[PDB]
Amino acid sequence: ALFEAVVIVLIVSFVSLGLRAGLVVACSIPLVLAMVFVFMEYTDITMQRVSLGALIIALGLLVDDAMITVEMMITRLELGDSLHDSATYAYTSTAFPMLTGTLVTVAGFVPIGLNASSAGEYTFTLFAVIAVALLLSWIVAVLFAPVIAVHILPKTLKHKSEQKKGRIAERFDSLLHLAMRRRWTTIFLTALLFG
Amino acid sequence: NSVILVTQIDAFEKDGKTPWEAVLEATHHRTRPILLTAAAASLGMIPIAREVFWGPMAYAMIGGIVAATLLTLIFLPALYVAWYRIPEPGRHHHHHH
Amino acid sequence: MAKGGFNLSDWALRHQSLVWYLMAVSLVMGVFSYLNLGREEDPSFAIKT
Amino acid sequence: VKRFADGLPANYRIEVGGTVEESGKAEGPIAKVVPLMLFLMATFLMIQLQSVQKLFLVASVAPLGLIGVVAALLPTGTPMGFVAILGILALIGIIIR
Numbered sequence: 058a059l060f061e062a063v064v065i066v067l068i069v070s071f072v073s074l075g076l077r078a079g080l081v082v083a084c085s086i087p088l089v090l091a092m093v094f095v096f097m098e099y100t101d102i103t104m105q106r107v108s109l110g111a112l113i114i115a116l117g118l119l120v121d122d123a124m125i126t127v128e129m130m131i132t133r134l135e136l137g138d139s140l141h142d143s144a145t146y147a148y149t150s151t152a153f154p155m156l157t158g159t160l161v162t163v164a165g166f167v168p169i170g171l172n173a174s175s176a177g178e179y180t181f182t183l184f185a186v187i188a189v190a191l192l193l194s195w196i197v198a199v200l201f202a203p204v205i206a207v208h209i210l211p212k213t214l215k216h217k218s219e220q221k222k223g224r225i226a227e228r229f230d231s232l233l234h235l236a237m238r239r240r241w242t243t244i245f246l247t248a249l250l251f252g
Numbered sequence: 253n254s255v256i257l258v259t260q261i262d263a264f265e266k267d268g269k270t271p272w273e274a275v276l277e278a279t280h281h282r283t284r285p286i287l288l289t290a291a292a293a294s295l296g297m298i299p300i301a302r303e304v305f306w307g308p309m310a311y312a313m314i315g316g317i318v319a320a321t322l323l324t325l326i327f328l329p330a331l332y333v334a335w336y337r338i339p340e341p342g343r344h345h346h347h348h349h
Numbered sequence: 350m351a352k353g354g355f356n357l358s359d360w361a362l363r364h365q366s367l368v369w370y371l372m373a374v375s376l377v378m379g380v381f382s383y384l385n386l387g388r389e390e391d392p393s394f395a396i397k398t
Numbered sequence: 399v400k401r402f403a404d405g406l407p408a409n410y411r412i413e414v415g416g417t418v419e420e421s422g423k424a425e426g427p428i429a430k431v432v433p434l435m436l437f438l439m440a441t442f443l444m445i446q447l448q449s450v451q452k453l454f455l456v457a458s459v460a461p462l463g464l465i466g467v468v469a470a471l472l473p474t475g476t477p478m479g480f481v482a483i484l485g486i487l488a489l490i491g492i493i494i495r
């Protein structure tokens with residue numbers, strides 16, 4: 058099942074960028090896996106189902122952050138100059154947000170890792186897994202994306218969007234305009250739905 | 253995700269551009285990434301969904317993720333622009349900005 | 350808030366071989382450690398009785 | 399003696415009772431611990447340097463130092479001391495320095 062989840066995320070990144078761009082990010086994913094493995098080794102946290110599920114969750118989140126970083130990099134470099142420095146500003150800008158969101162998520166995970174109940178045992182493993190994985194993931198994303206880009210990435214191009222998603226964009230922009238046409242209606246709908 | 257969006261919005265708004273067009277460009281710029289974010293979030297749990305252990309939690313996760321994302325796409329824009337066009341609350345303090 | 354720092358990009362771009370070696374050593378370390386990790390059904394919660 | 403032992407029913411067994419057992423037990427974790435620290439100090443060196451070429455260059459001097467450790471030991475006929483088995487590592491460190 059682990060390999061299955063890995064390959065589905067793989068095809069996700071494949072169809073996302075089309076080109077073999079996010080594929081290098083996928084190649085970078087196993088790194089954090091080995092790191093958390095050695096971490097468990099030092100902490101003797103052996104393997105079991107629970108930890109595997111935690112691994113799946115953590116891998117999804119970390120690959121999400123890494124992929125969005127790579128996407129914004131390639132987009133900002135494609136729409137403009139083709140240079141590592143033509144992306145250093147993107148790094149300097151969107152760096153802090155990644156850290157913030159990641160830490161916020163680890164905080165949201167924390168609760169399950171504090172109960173003294175008999176159930177807290179199974180939760181302790183997944184908590185440690187998620188925490189270490191997410192942190193090492195952020196450091197990897199901010200410390201490896203440069204070389205991986207400077208060596209396995211083409212130059213810039215001209216703006217263009219996949220026409221298949223064109224109809225989806227039409228519907229999205231239209232619904233956006235309509236939602237702006239009557240803001241109070243959206244609030245009413247949200248209220249009734251939540252209630 | 254919500255933090256990412258608000259940061260992207262107020263990011264270029266520092267230039268004092270048209271709030272309408274500002275939020276418009278913010279959405280047009282964050283449309284593609286948030287999609288992949290929601291994908292990676294919801295997915296991953298699919299192959300293990302067959303496992304009876306991680307059962308209801310998997311469905312609840314994949315459901316709430318899609319819901320929260322859709323609203324992150326439509327709800328917050330209208331809400332923020334509404335709160336912007338006019339301050340609904342009051343309670344003004346004479347000794348504070 | 351981007352005050353007196355932001356050297357992440359440049360320093361990352363620089364010291365290329367350093368990051369390269371760090372990545373390599375980390376990878377091999379995790380690889381070798383994987384075999385000696387340990388597999389078990391599920392954590393043994395402390396029974397109280 | 400091993401062959402002699404082999405020439406006997408399987409239900410029986412022979413073992414040593416000297417000091418080799420204790421020596422091996424003591425040096426047990428050594429083998430399973432020292433290489434990790436070796437890679438640790440290697441990376442430590444790579445911090446000050448920036449090329450694997452210079453790394454291997456200075457590393458070549460490390461093993462070659464085993465010349466004197468034995469040249470000044472064979473004529474005296476002094477047995478290999480455990481303390482030396484330890485100090486040789488310090489020798490490696492200083493020569494690399």
Ligand SMILES: CCCCCCCCCCCCO[C@H]1O[C@H](CO)[C@@H](O[C@H]2O[C@H](CO)[C@@H](O)[C@H](O)[C@H]2O)[C@H](O)[C@H]1O
Nearest residue numbers: 095096097098099100101382385427430431433434435
């Ligand atoms: C006088 C006051 C002190 C009295 C004696 C205290 C001596 C030093 C403190 C003992 C703490 C034990 O900690 C020690 O455990 C293991 C020893 O096998 C070491 O090694 C451990 O970690 C390594 C990296 O994760 C793994 O490769 C090893 O398999 C693992 O055993 C630890 O890196 C070390 O931290």
